[PDB]
Amino acid sequence: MPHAFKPGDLVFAKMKGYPHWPARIDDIADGAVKPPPNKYPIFFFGTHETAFLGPKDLFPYDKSKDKYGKPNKRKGFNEGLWEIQNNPHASYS
Numbered sequence: 001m002p003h004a005f006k007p008g009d010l011v012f013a014k015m016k017g018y019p020h021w022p023a024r025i026d027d028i029a030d031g032a033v034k035p036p037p038n039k040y041p042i043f044f045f046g047t048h049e050t051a052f053l054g055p056k057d058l059f060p061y062d063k064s065k066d067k068y069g070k071p072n073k074r075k076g077f078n079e080g081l082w083e084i085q086n087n088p089h090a091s092y093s
Contacts, residue, residue, distance in 0.1 A: 005025050005040055005058060006025065007025050007026060008025065009024065009061075010023075010060070010062075010084055010088050011023050011024065011025065011042075011058045011060055011061055011064075012058075012061065012064050012065075013051070013053055013057055013058055013059075015053070018074070019068070019074065019077070020059060020068040021044050021045070021077070021080060022045035022083065023043060023044050023058075023084075024043045024084070024088060024089075025040050025041070025042065025043075026041040027041075028041060035052045039053060039054050040053060040054075040055075040058075043092070044076070044080065045076075045081070045082075045083040045088070046075075046076030046077055046078070046081075046082075047075065047076035047080065048076075048092050061084065069081060069085075
């Protein structure tokens with residue numbers, strides 16, 4: 001069965017005025033800003049941006065990749081698809 005979201009989960013994260021985007025749940029580093037309550041830190045593949053998102057905006061990857069894992073023209077997108085398929089636990093420093 002399903003559990004709660006945890007650092008390392010792979011997902012597609014929806015944000016207003018964007019397509020479902022390759023993304024991961026991040027850990028919080030020591031000293032680093034916590035997310036609001038009930039939100040998680042979301043690291044977007046390709047663009048390398050962060051955001052703070054509740055589950056209603058989080059589609060787990062395996063289930064969803066057939067729907068949302070397709071090329072898109074937006075900046076970062078197709079890099080992002082590469083990352084989540086090929087090295088999704090990497091350090092993108």
